[PDB]
Amino acid sequence: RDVFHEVVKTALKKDGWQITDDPLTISVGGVNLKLIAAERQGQKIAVEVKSFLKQSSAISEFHTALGQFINYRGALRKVEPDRVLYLAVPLTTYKTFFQLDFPKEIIIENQVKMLVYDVEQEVIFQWIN
């Protein structure tokens, strides 16, 4: 987990993003919810890092990742509404699991913004807004 977290931080910095908080902690509405907070030229983001390791089903990993995304997005609206949340996904996962019809559709239905990163090279491949 720490490794993939560091890969995404590296990929962000290579594109000129400034890491401002890690973890970004969010407390709201009676609940305390490691997200990466970053910014570039005043544009603020939060990144939910996932590795989608073969150790568990991609679908089980997706359930938790999706729920986290919706909760974090909902919380951020009411705490830091200018900070946009992205789900960070490895390119390999993006090209396989996320090209299957169902996950692709759920992501779109739920406006799940994504940061697709190449793990080996530690770079940002694509932002999906």
Added chain:
Amino acid sequence: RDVFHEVVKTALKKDGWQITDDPLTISVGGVNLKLIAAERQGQKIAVEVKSFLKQSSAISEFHTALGQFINYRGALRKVEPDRVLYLAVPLTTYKTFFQLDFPKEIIIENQVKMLVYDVEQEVIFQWIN
């Protein structure tokens, strides 16, 4: 898990619901996603059972429950669109965690329908549509 599953089945049957599948299996769009399928007077439902045990944070349990709910709901639309999905929550959880401002708001923002059940008495307390 099996215990709470049986409690909800018991609660459903006491209210005249006929259990038709357990587990209700859902395969769609390249993914194979124990939901309870039940019906009464032609009205069809699917129930996602959660116990919200103190072993883990309620928020962590909620992330996974929410993601599962959204995925199952989205899959059911495209497979069995007349079967309405409910998140089954214990009354104790309902009166505590789900009365906190944040979870309450996320549930409403996401149309998370609920079946609130009393665990000790094994009855359905409230349907939240």
